[PDB]
Design a protein around this ligand. Structure first.
Ligand SMILES: [Cl-]
Ligand code: NA
Length: 129
């Protein structure tokens, strides 16, 4: 599913991501834009052989099992394919673990390089939330 911007904002808000660990909703929408272009089916292989899955590009080295990543810890206890669903529940519940792991949203490369320090409230402009 390719979400609309405000559609995704409303879903992320429903699941409690607004100001989760202090990160306002626009941070999460910005991250999803630049990680996946709002596409739940996005997958991208990393140089280390791991793959990133879904709307928030969650990585198979630590967080989900894809059966092809040596040393996978599967800390979210899910198959990576569950992160590709049109229902974002699994991605959100895993992202809450990730953002609580110590480095905050710096875990997301696209957030660090493209959202951090910018006017992230623009990402929720116009949305009825
Ligand atoms: Cl933080
Ligand atoms: Na893993």
């Amino acid at each position: 599913k390719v979400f609309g911007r405000c559609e995704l904002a409303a879903a992320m808000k429903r699941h409690g991501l607004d100001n989760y660990r202090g990160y306002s909703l626009g941070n999460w929408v910005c991250a999803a834009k630049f990680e996946s272009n709002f596409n739940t089916q996005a997958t991208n292989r990393n140089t280390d052989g791991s793959t990133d899955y879904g709307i928030l590009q969650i990585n198979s080295r630590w967080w989900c099992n894809d059966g092809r990543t040596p040393g996978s810890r599967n800390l979210c206890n899910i198959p990576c394919s569950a992160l590709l669903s049109s229902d974002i529940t699994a991605s959100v519940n895993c992202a809450k673990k990730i953002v609580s792991d110590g480095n905050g949203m710096n875990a997301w490369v696209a957030w660090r390089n493209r959202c951090k320090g910018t006017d992230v409230q623009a990402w929720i402009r116009g949305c009825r939330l």
